[PDB]
Amino acid sequence: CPLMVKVLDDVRGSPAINVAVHVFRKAADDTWEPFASGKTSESGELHGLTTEEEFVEGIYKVEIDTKSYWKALGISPFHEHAEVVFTANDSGPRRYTIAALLSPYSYSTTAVVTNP
């Protein structure tokens, strides 16, 4: 599993469950092509987005649907989504974990990158 996303809720001190995540890959015409998507589990994690084969080198955008998460909890948020944009696999396959720590008017995002 070469791309994983983990999301935490900093208001309630819990994993952020059922958060929609969309991944896009920058296409040759500079548009964003849908690549993969899913929802976080009860642990706040989203596994199984892609495979080593499918996950070619390129520029990827991970969009985390934070606004819907806050709306479901009955909280007024500021951001539409959290966005993480990065070049992946430029020197061969790597494994990427994108974390997002969410508050209504702020978020933090970190990447952990490991070599298989």
Choose from Ca ion, its own copies, none: what does 90 bind? Cβ within 5-8 Å by kind: Ca ion
8 A C-beta contact, residue 45 and residue 100: no
Is residue 83 within the footprint of Ca ion (CB under 5 A)? no
Q: Phi and psi dihedrals of 49, rounded to 5?
A: -60, -40
Q: What is the DSSP letter of 52?
A: T
- Shortest Å distance, C-beta 112 to its own copies: 8
Tell me if 57 is assigned to a ligand binding site: no
- Shortest Å distance, C-beta 68 to its own copies: 13
Tell me if 45 is assigned to a ligand binding site: yes
Is residue 90 within the footprint of Ca ion (CB under 5 A)? yes
Binding to its own copies in span 64-93, by CB under 8 A: 78-81, 83-87
Which SS3 state, helix, strand or coil, does residue 57 take? coil
Binding to its own copies in span 29-48, by CB under 8 A: none
In one letter, which amino acid is 83?
Answer: E
CA atoms in the 13 A half-sphere facing the CB of 33: 9
For residue 87, the Cα-to-chain-centroid distance in whole angstroms is 14
Gap between the Cα atoms of 67 and 75, Å rounded: 9
Binding site for L-thyroxine, residues?
A: 6, 45, 108
Residues that bind Ca ion (CB under 5 A): 90
Residues that bind its own copies (CB under 8 A): 59, 78-81, 83-87, 105-113
